[PDB]
């Protein structure tokens, strides 16, 4: 019966917080972003040509 309207983004992006409580999930969000950053660094740093560790002997 009910027919939801088509949402317009990014204008209705704020509605995500109506669904997802920031008090519970904002920190998990930041931690996930950090985990991505760590994983990406791990794959790039593993390449010896893309890390600053250049001390010889």
């Amino acid at each position: 019966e009910y027919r939801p309207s088509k949402p317009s983004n990014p204008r209705d992006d704020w509605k995500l917080w109506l669904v997802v409580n920031p008090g519970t999930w904002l920190m998990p969000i930041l931690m996930a972003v950090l985990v991505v950053a760590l994983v990406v660094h791990a794959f790039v740093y593993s390449n010896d040509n893309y890390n600053p560790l250049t001390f010889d002997a």
Binding site: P4, P7, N9
Partner: protein
Amino acid sequence: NSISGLTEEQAKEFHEQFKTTFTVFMVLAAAAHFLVFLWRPFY
């Protein structure tokens, strides 16, 4: 008395946004697969 607690309107509204966002994510993923095949073909 839904299991999740959501009303029908809530579930439908959330699903509508979910579907829209998923569609854009998929279009972008298809774009990225096309670009990566152009850059480095696979198979």
